[PDB]
């Protein structure tokens, strides 16, 4: 998502959670932490929508 583009998707800012060790409990904690970071990409998306065509 930030080594290739999709869309106008470069114009948002967020960080990509990493794990320390290599087990299930620290690939669990990505999924809890990505849900907090998805609220940031929604709240950054309401401010930016240009009116226009579809």
């Amino acid at each position: 998502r930030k080594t290739q583009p999709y869309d106008v998707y470069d114009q948002v800012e967020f960080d990509v959670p990493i794990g320390s060790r290599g087990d299930c409990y620290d690939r669990y904690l990505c999924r809890v932490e990505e849900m907090r970071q998805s609220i940031r990409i929604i709240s950054q998306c309401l401010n930016k929508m240009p009116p226009g065509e579809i």
Binding site: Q37, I39, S43, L46, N47, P51
Partner: protein, 67 residues
């Protein structure tokens, strides 16, 4: 010309993570526990010792009869 986004009115909501409320820890506990437990045994020796006195009275009525 009827399209969505407002001119203003926003938050946002946080991305944060916090509820570390302490909590009565760290030598406060292990001190209310022992202070409660020693009140228990102090409430013993006033009943178990006292029941031992009425116990001998119960044997007393036996021995004053049976000739």
């Amino acid at each position: 010309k009827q399209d969505m986004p407002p001119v203003g009115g926003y938050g946002p909501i946080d991305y944060k993570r916090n509820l570390p409320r302490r909590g009565l820890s760290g030598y406060s506990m292990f001190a209310v526990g022992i202070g409660a437990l020693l009140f228990g045994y102090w409430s013993m020796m006033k009943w178990n010792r006292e029941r031992r006195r009425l116990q001998i009275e119960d044997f007393e009525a036996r021995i004053a009869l049976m000739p």
